[model samples]
Target chain A: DLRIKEIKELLPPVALLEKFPATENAANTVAHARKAIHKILKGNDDRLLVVIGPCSIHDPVAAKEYATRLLALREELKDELEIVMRVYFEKPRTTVGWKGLINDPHMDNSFQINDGLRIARKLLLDINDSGLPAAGEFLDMITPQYLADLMSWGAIGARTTESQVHRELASGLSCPVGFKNGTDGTIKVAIDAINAAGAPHCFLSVTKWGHSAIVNTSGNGDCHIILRGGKEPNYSAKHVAEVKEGLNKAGLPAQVMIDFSHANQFKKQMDVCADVCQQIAGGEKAIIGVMVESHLVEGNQSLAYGKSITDACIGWEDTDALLRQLANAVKARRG
Target chain B: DLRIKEIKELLPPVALLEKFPATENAANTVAHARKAIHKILKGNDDRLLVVIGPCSIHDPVAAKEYATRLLALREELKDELEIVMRVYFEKPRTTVGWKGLINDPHMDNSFQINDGLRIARKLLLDINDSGLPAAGEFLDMITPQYLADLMSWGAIGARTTESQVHRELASGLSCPVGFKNGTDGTIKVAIDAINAAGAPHCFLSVTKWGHSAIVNTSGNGDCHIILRGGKEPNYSAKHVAEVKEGLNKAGLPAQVMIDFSHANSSKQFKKQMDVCADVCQQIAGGEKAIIGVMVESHLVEGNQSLESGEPLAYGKSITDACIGWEDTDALLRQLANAVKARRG
Candidate 1:
């Protein structure tokens, strides 16, 4: 109230909903994807939950190309993996460069957040309509309202995992959400997040009418932790044992996921996925999922078709090569 | 190149849906109501469809109170009549107009239509969630996307009976729809509308996205004509015979419904009962063509003015005058008794 410049009101959440209404096919895709993730998190389904795609999305065209390719791979590996396309529109930075697509969709820093909301929602509906569900990182807590109905999975970033507000946002999310450990490589905050988000929350948020309101959520129990290696790579058997035991000590289910791309890429991100998969194959019950940053044209610094401007991702060839290996590992575990 | 006032975007249709989302009960209520109306119109269900309620909705609180009360009587008379509460939020205005709730929700000239959308949607959800479905008149073609999903049946008013655009709107409606005869008492417009809406049409309209796009409708066949008696009364058996003949000659079903209000009641709202009684007597005589009826009823009879600088009377019509609840209840029972007698 004291140091404010100007507060602009963009289109409300329901405007996107009306303009980009979910077709019957898109609705069923999101519902089925969420159901599958809930089952995998609960041990009712033995498939590994693979949240895979680019590290960040800046282009809608190539993101859809990546989604179309991944959906085929998903259909091929449906038995051993529940694949959700990682579509991160908002990103949190240590200082703040370009805060992903929703903040600077023009990629020139105009910050037409209004246009970003429309672009993101329209793209989300398009992807789901293609029969592929999507995942997003909830950075700006308010942004999810514009796009969450079209998503099947959500993520709380490692940078904000310890923040109570992020956890509260996860609590009200209609889809299953996962928490990444702190950037400094601690599991405590991630564990706390899982616990916190699995309870009822009352918080301030905007209603569909673009008015501020107190929102009450009926506790999202479908929350789990993702270990995106901190200071030291943490996808080893012992790291898995420590994370599972810590979760168990907290009186929660011993379920965890590993993000092979983030900080764990000390080894090739491709190798980390196979490494986590081998453990799951040899009785790693707590490793329910793995996240990978894979795009059409990898080696970051932006798309020559489908590349990431945020972080380096494995190329399409390597992604198919690596994910196919993980599927075999899951099949081995099944045997 | 254009003559335009300040063009503004109101909240899109989905905004109302999100703030006042339909519960599972409301969804089921709409589905069952639509299915029952379809059956009645198709000659499959012998029950008469009675569309009755306030002439227009202004106060949501009193509107819901009227809904709950009607729902009780609806359940009691379920065996013979499929009762859908008339929850009209839009009206056909003359040049001097209030334009009903959606245009001026506060009855002041504020014209906060966005707020009116939210108010109307939430009220319909509340009413439908109470196990009573709604009947609406499509006054503005664009308004349905905001409220039609909750409505079980829709009507094309006598004023719009000849509009081609209204016919196209009726064609895309997910629920059964009816067309009222023209205000001047001619049945030709109603007959032509039924034929037009029963066929597929591609026309100019907005998508759910609120942008102008070509809307393609899979021709709606669940359309019938309602004779709201015109320049003269048409609920008489002789008038019904002519209406059926008109429909049959057009290769449409010989089905017709009578709106006991409007000109049929001859500006005397109580005369609506006389029309209902005459039709009940026809049903008792094994009349098979009259499948539906419309009545304007509320807790209080007659109408009040929004311009009077007086607060609106609770549950009274602010548009056309209406029959009170006691008369509505007794009239509904008599209609059911006629159906029972016909069955015997």
Candidate 2:
């Protein structure tokens, strides 16, 4: 009854972290994470912070396996590289649809949120344990409170980047945030979003104890752009060059992360790797990062019956080779 | 092997309507569709054209049944009446979802576009056959080329109202096009749509034979506003007064339609009916002219799932929940009565 004052410590489970050890290599990812933050805020070189990985960690075995493959290449291209593993869990839908694993860890809509928190925390810790900093797209404003400790970078996708609420949430985030432009190919809205997110604000948020509170935060300086293109391709050399010039003109630093999904490759799975490779070749030094949408499978399947609720991503073997290819491109270019 | 001219001469379905009928409705709706059109456009003084009905009319028996309910109310308040039946067939989703009944009637992924077209045309004919002119949301550019003949009113929803392509489509549309405001709650965009649709423009579209055509049209003068409110509600007396003032300042007509769905009632199905009744009361004595109101209704009480890869809900929606049949009838009575009282 008198416990509120007596407690010196409020703690959450460290069991999730115990499941995955923080190795020496894991400690090195800290420098890379800091470099990404610095590059967006103060650095000059257009060194890309490529944070690409699976959309879901449904299969943890597959994820660690993928990370194991990427770690070797991560070391080889360690000079020009700021590669972060995307261990996304929650997904936002337009209308009444699947509300991601964190909302309902069980596939059936029973919504075992407790289990979701457990699984998500455990998996994120495991990935961060691999000596790689993690990045994820934030869908729920509250999910970060329980899970953000494991992540070093984050993104708000094109769909929700324009939302003022999301912008407010992003302003208070501990790490750097990337705001993608609109899905229908509008850059101005995204620019507005970046501007909005970089401003200091007080907003509604869940406290560490899970109670709602008005949170005040100084503006996040590590805000940057991620161009995934739209209905019309926005990743062309001319487009990237124009974007870089726009950044320079706006008094904002010239750096962008490019996603090879959606309008970039015109939604083709095979072209994701090729699209990134082409960007590397295109002499658009303003492109500081690349994102690939891939998974355990080589090709996407339909989502109706025997399908994925999200999308059919490229398979594992292909993703492995593509990672090596990206590493080689960065190594060659950095030299 | 023949050109469109020769084939159009042979196909009665394609020939007479493409060249003449569009211009005919363009003229008739502009002339006859105006008094009701003017009420909404003339601003907060008159009874607005409250266009409500189903999302689509794939089932004729059900549509006529719904229309029967509307027609009874249509008669009781003939003095303050301009109710067009909404028989929308094209459904647009964010990513890859069901296109609409007009694109795929069987809900099967296998698109039977021709059959969907025939069913759409037949349904519109039946609705018009009952002396009730229909309202259809024009999504596909080519859809109207085939089905516009039967529609009395049309709309460009919030999703496409900003597209230059849709604006060009609206420029040539036969019926008075009601442009909905953006879903994110901005009024300038819907006003811009009104300006764009009201301007003479050359745009891309399909001919009756489904050939690509660069159609040139002298802007639709009857284009007006439909405030399907947005992420925030905009149906108050003050809000309508502001919209009326915006119209007056812009030198455009003062008419605007209030949409109860989307964000207006904030997706509360039962609350929507009450909101409409309140708007009706406001229309009766408050504003200049409540030009029209829009509602999404069907036989069922609420929305159902779209994820049925096999046997989907027969009557439920894949997108939104709507008012049920019985409540719709009750609400229509209240609306018609309010219109009659407001006629003074």
Candidate 3:
């Protein structure tokens, strides 16, 4: 009798979409970006797919500024790298902490989920409207019904990569998906996840109309793996090769993406980015993408612009330098 | 690329409610019926709850006619029986047959779920407007978001009585819920269902706004048991006493409602009238914890096949056989007299 306290009704998907209608630019950006990412995953496009942004969003104003700044850089690197802003609103916790922007937008423990939903969806719409593609971590299953249609790419975190539930969800997403390796430096989980999502599956899910129904997916063939490292760094040449063989053994494409976080040292992000770029230049055919926790300011906390309230991020200057080096690396690979 | 053919959006809960808004009489009927049923479960009300209707509603015109007929007799026996119309729009099947009116209202292969939603809600609205409450089986979990608010009582069938999923659904229902015994004539499943529903639980559910969210229910206390006979008929006095003891031992109230269909007849669904008479005798012979009985009755007797490619007969059941309207009226009078006999 004492378990559930109260239930406040949140806005529906259709109502929310009506309020913050997707701009014409957003639809074009989503369609173009998804098409490009699909090609990159299949090796048809040799451009490096770099999904870079802050660890988690806390302030919408700073988020828009970050997106505004990335627009110019994204254009300059358009031929060499397909850049998508990491517009993650939900974060996974080991046990329990601040859930995410949508769960507690005020950050004062007041879970005004309705306000958070509106804020997150509107920001994603705005970012895509700015001619920049959006990438988000698919944390909660229900969040996708309200935002997935506007996204170009989605990530399954390490904690959920081995989950058959998240795999089934990724199968239904309209864009390319990335599943990170397990927390034990093993590549089998992600390989299995990719293969599982490549086949048809059925599960109970929320409809775009926001109702509960049995969702059937024809399987997503554009699923790849990201090595975020575990116990020790797996974002290296040896680790990448091992993962490539594992993918082939599991009957999947040998495509791989590296994340410059987790077991990879934060101070060595540029080295990691440069490390993957050199591999690409040296004909490392399997390494096709990379991820960075980047923002307007370095690290986290009480700075005004694009400061992460969750994880430490590479600042704007380093993010800019990292992408330029990545573009040059692709230029060399082109020769 | 071929698994999902197409997903036609259904009308939202709010839109459907607006299309056929709950009339004033419907609102009043629901509130009173829920409160009255709550008292009946706790043994505070002397009136027996005789839930009577067709096996499954196939035609709305015939359904409204049946509802109109029951109104006068329901009022006539209002002193001793709390009559609630059985307005089931969904049914459980073994493999794959015609689901129910709400699944494919045209009774054809086409699944116009949106149209089914409209028809089912409209029928419930009109039935409640008659100042009579309605009962349905909680078959599909999502169906409740669109139709449950209009119901005063719900039944969880024998197959799903042991399901934790249905138990969680019942815990949040605004009205009283009944869980039938196990399919093998065991009483433990219903007892567990009652216990679990009495405590708070949470599950993924579609909101009335037609959105998905984790719904938190404030644990329903008005949950009781219904004994629909399984492999053998558990409607006898000994079976009732055994179930009563099982409920008591599980820290639940010794309240039991008897349904004389399904396994109660052992494939012969024609004994509801005679069976109702025997249960009335048992009640008259002094069965205190026996709260009520249920009968699958309609305007006509016997069932028809929808697969025969013919239109269903008016007021006749398309799912299972039921007693005729004349037998329903006779049973109502006999059940009312039994309550008076038990009073002495």
lDDT of 3 at A214: 51
What DockQ do you compute for every candidate structure? 0.01, 0.01, 0.09
Cα lDDT of model 1 by residue, A1-335, tens digit: 11112334467677888999999989999999998988887789888888889988888999888999999999999998888999999865432256678877898846677788888998889999999999998876457667888989998876556555566578788899898876557787677777777766544344565544345566678888888777788888888898888988988889888888767742288778778878977867678888888889878773377978988888899889877888888887788
lDDT agreement with native, every candidate: 0.80, 0.64, 0.81
What lDDT, from 0 to 1, does candidate 3 have?
A: 0.81
**Per-model TM against the reference:** 0.51, 0.52, 0.57
Best DockQ among the predictions, by candidate number: 3
Candidate 3: Cα lDDT at A135 = 93
Candidate 1 clashing pairs?
Answer: A19-B209
CAPRI quality level assigned to candidate 3 from its DockQ score: incorrect
- Scoring model 2 with DockQ, what do you get? 0.01
Chain B TM-score of every predicted model = 0.97, 0.85, 0.97
- List the candidates ranked by lDDT, beginning with the highest: 3, 1, 2
Of 2 and 3, the candidate ranking higher by DockQ: 3
Worst 10 residues of 2 chain B by lDDT: B1-10
